[PDB]
Design a protein around this ligand. Structure first.
Ligand SMILES: O=C(O)c1ccc[n+]([C@@H]2O[C@H](COP(=O)([O-])O)[C@@H](O)[C@H]2O)c1
Ligand SMILES: O=C(O)c1ccc[n+]([C@@H]2O[C@H](COP(=O)([O-])O)[C@@H](O)[C@H]2O)c1
Ligand SMILES: Cc1cc(N)c(N)cc1C
Ligand SMILES: Cc1cc(N)c(N)cc1C
Lengths: 346, 346
């Protein structure tokens, strides 16, 4: 794991320089394509893409798991929905499945801790039947966190061998916006009230209880904000740990990762805390309607491309933004050049 | 033309109701897909789509024309770039061509007033070799404006016959952000300084001159803000008139139109002023980096889906958002239902 974090490659400034020069000479006013140009350059710096903005196979990894904190009354959805929905993921009827299909990406459903019997067709990496109730103690041990990080990381970079060049991350777990809020609060230094949202339609009246639970989880566990793994194991979850692992794996693989919503933001904060070298590989997708989204994105210093007021999770936003990443590549490779048209601009 | 505006159909509330009910029963927390759900319902109300959110063939109409106000030193790009770029549009090497190809849409290049010899492969609807310099008088006569509106409208709704269900609008004309700013100023009531931007990389030092020109154009022409056609003919342009015509044509055809950038916003203001019934058919794409974008979007009461800091024009943003429109349809048609999975939510 120390080896893993140690070998994360730095962006290729040489490739980025050639990219910028090429973009500037395209049939358009310099910089007129805004963030599309910026995105194209970023990709070019990623060693896994071979010095150029390109997109081969696409995959969305969905980490599924249950949370003990569900018993604290912080989620209105039945607990079994996690297992049921994970199963639907294999049938391609879920939101991320439909959106991924539109983007030509493949959805990988991974069980890292669902509290139910194993689901056929689902990748099995189950740590336990649900994580501990963070309200009264840790969600898991530090070893269980590190082990899962390692496992998911290898799985991710292994997919690279099969031709995957763009990753999307997502989750599925009833009550997971609670540990996510706790993590955001700890990494950010913001009060729980500022980060706790309604998750999956939590009634406004029950919001006060959710804030109390987050506070309790933090007071009891005393997670070290300077230790990302410590925070994840104490007030996080298996699904959140998995998302972090995907980010570390892609970074080590020198490939781009598309974040999704609020849950992915907390995992991204943890990842960047564990290994800053990961940041250059992160690509935002949309701006989650969850209350604590603005704060989480600010500390990540990211500005999403899409404002859809989405809050489904599953990696649905990640899939929706994949066409954008491909558009930056198309621009870079298919556009004509000013010089070829004898156009000279000041 | 009065017949045209008179026959614009109202949205189908019955179809929209069935749509909302169907979306609410999808395999996800009600409303969790945010603006995707809202978009899906909007499409369902459009009579041309036959009571359901669907997308058949896609087209982007690019209105090209030159402006006399160019001689006032408000644009840094050579005037011939309009003709040269219009030609490149036929070769598929321009920004909108590359982005449209990615979206599977066809680009229609239409010449409504380029100041150069006719370009082969370009649809000819030329009103004149460039419009009048709005700084010293009107850009065109009221009749020339009404005639072009009618011509473009018919062309647009005629494409519907060929299977087009989604339209994208765009333009090409050196110096056109000047008349666009003038129009936004008049329709909005905002001062020129608040709406004039740098267009295609206009040096910050030359911005003062551009503001003066806009003021002069308004003072001399005295356009009636309550008369959209009056405003277009006086301080608008052929390309701006064409964009307005596309919007009126699609609306009459009961079909959706994707706006592009700042130039499209001014055309949209004019269109909604001429016929309010057009508003329900307008779909925003991205948020233009042009200074007067926020104000124009506010009066249009629209919130773009994409924040790419783009300012190329051509309809490049419109093309970039087409996948989003298709995603709303995919969600609506391909997602599973809660009842089928025995999932019950409060
Ligand atoms: O991705 C987001 O921004 C997102 C925001 C709110 C809710 N969710 C989804 O809803 C679940 C978490 O909501 P909750 O109320 O059970 O804490 C989880 O399974 C996520 O997939 C996801
Ligand atoms: O669409 C926009 O928001 C947009 C914003 C700024 C500039 N443009 C493009 O640049 C041209 C107008 O810029 P300018 O400086 O000649 O007034 C015109 O041909 C447009 O296609 C387009
Ligand atoms: C200079 C220039 C300006 C614009 N507006 C466009 N579309 C293209 C080029 C090349
Ligand atoms: C209830 C519920 C919640 C979530 N978070 C998801 N993805 C799906 C469903 C059905």
């Amino acid at each position: 794991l120390h080896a893993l974090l140690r070998d994360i490659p730095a962006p290729d400034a040489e490739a980025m320089a050639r990219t910028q020069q090429h973009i500037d000479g395209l049939l358009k006013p310099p910089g007129s394509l805004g963030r599309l140009e910026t995105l194209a350059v970023q990709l070019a710096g990623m060693p896994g893409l071979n010095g150029t903005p390109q997109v081969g196979e696409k995959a969305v990894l969905v980490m599924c798991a249950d949370h003990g904190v569900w018993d604290e009354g912080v989620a209105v959805s039945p607990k079994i929905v996690t297992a049921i929905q994970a199963a639907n993921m294999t049938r391609g009827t879920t939101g991320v499945c439909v959106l991924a299909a539109q983007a030509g990406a493949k959805v990988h459903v991974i069980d890292v801790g669902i509290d139910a019997e194993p689901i056929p067709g689902v990748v099995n990496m189950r740590v336990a039947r649900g994580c501990g109730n963070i309200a009264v103690g840790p969600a898991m041990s530090r070893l269980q966190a590190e082990a899962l990080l390692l496992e998911v990381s290898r799985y991710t970079c292994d997919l690279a061998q099969r031709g995957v060049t763009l990753f999307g991350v997502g989750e599925l777990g009833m009550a997971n916006t609670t540990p996510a809020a706790a993590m955001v609060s700890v990494f950010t230094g913001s009060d729980a009230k500022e980060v706790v949202g309604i998750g999956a339609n939590l009634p406004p009246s029950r919001i006060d209880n959710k804030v109390d639970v987050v506070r309790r989880a933090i007071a009891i566990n005393q997670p070290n904000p300077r230790d990302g793994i410590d925070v994840l194991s104490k007030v996080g979850g298996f699904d959140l740990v998995g998302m972090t692992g995907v980010m570390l794996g892609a970074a080590r693989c020198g490939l781009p990762v598309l974040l999704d919503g609020f849950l992915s933001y907390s995992a991204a904060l943890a990842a960047c805390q564990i290994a800053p070298a990961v940041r250059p590989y992160l690509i935002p997708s949309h701006f989650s309607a969850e209350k604590g989204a603005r704060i989480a994105l600010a500390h990540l210093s990211m500005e999403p491309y899409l404002h859809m007021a989405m809050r489904l999770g599953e990696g649905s936003g990640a899939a929706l933004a994949m066409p954008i990443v491909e558009a930056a590549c198309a621009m870079f490779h298919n556009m004509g050049e000013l010089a070829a048209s004898n156009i000279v601009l000041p």
